[PDB]
Write a protein that binds this ligand. Structure first.
Ligand SMILES: COc1cc(-c2cnn(C)c2)ccc1Nc1ncc2ccnc(NC3CCCCC3)c2n1
Length: 258
């Protein structure tokens, strides 16, 4: 099987993942260079979701120049029937990497964190809040973490969702850049303690309650990296006004001092 995108032929090596009407394929161009093609079957798409894809593609194209921490979008084809996006192919997504890894290098964790702050910070500058950040939104490419999507179009899984990274303010509102800080904090906590802050809570209703309860104290076990522990405490503050900002996270010793 092979596909054509803007007159360029790509042979499919394998399907990396499938989400909804969208599929991701590892592919090779004529020169044998590797790429990831995202295929979206628009045949059963509503004007709201169709628009979301248009918005996601526009931002992705727009944010190309601003940061290298955002996945490369080389080309794309849009028709009433389908969408093809030619993107750089990464080794693996951060989620699948974390599920696999028995332990994580302190340097790698710090480097990955920095990449994440840079990518997320970039989208914030353009007025975009992902609001659905999780490890699966990050791709490891060349030992570097890149943001795959901006939370506008539907998420994909390799070949079920989670409320583990949800900020308290999102639950209570029944969403500002601080909401992404909470989620990034949950990712870092996971990379630090091998679990998310509320993973232990099996009962989902209880979990949401734990997330919004001031009296529920998140555990921050002592570790050699005292700066890392402070980052975690500052990202996981329930009051978004008191929660640390990305610009402040970028001036933190944890990311500045080595
Ligand atoms: C080598 O190829 C890959 C393998 C895996 C992998 C390995 N083991 N497991 C369990 C997964 C994950 C990712 C990649 N590479 C990749 N490169 C560019 C992408 C552009 C958009 N979307 C992607 N994947 C979406 C669907 C997959 C999850 C992330 C979102 C992309 N995935």
């Amino acid at each position: 099987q092979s596909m054509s995108v803007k007159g360029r032929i790509y042979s499919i090596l394998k399907q990396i993942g499938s989400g909804g009407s969208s599929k991701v394929f590892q592919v090779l161009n004529e020169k044998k260079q590797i790429y990831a093609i995202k295929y979206v079957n628009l045949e059963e798409a509503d004007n709201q979701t169709l628009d979301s894809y248009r918005n996601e593609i526009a931002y992705l194209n727009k944010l190309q120049q601003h940061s290298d921490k955002i996945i490369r979008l080389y080309d794309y084809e849009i028709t009433d029937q389908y969408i093809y996006m030619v993107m750089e192919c990464g080794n693996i997504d951060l989620n699948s990497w974390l599920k696999k890894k028995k332990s994580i290098d302190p340097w790698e964790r710090k480097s990955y964190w920095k990449n994440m702050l840079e990518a997320v910070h970039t989208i914030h500058q353009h007025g975009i809040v992902h609001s659905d950040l999780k490890p699966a939104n990050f791709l490891i490419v060349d030992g570097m973490l890149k943001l795959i999507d901006f939370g506008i179009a539907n998420q994909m899984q390799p070949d079920v969702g989670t409320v583990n990274y949800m900020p308290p303010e999102a639950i209570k509102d029944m969403i500002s850049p601080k909401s992404d800080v909470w989620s990034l904090g949950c990712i870092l906590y996971y990379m630090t303690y091998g679990k998310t802050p509320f993973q232990q809570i099996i009962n989902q209703i209880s979990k949401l309650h734990a997330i919004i309860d001031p009296n529920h104290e998140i555990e921050f076990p002592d570790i050699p990296e005292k700066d890392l522990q402070d980052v975690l405490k500052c990202c996981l503050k329930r009051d978004p006004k008191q929660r640390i900002s990305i610009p402040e996270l970028l001036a933190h010793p944890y990311v500045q001092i080595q």
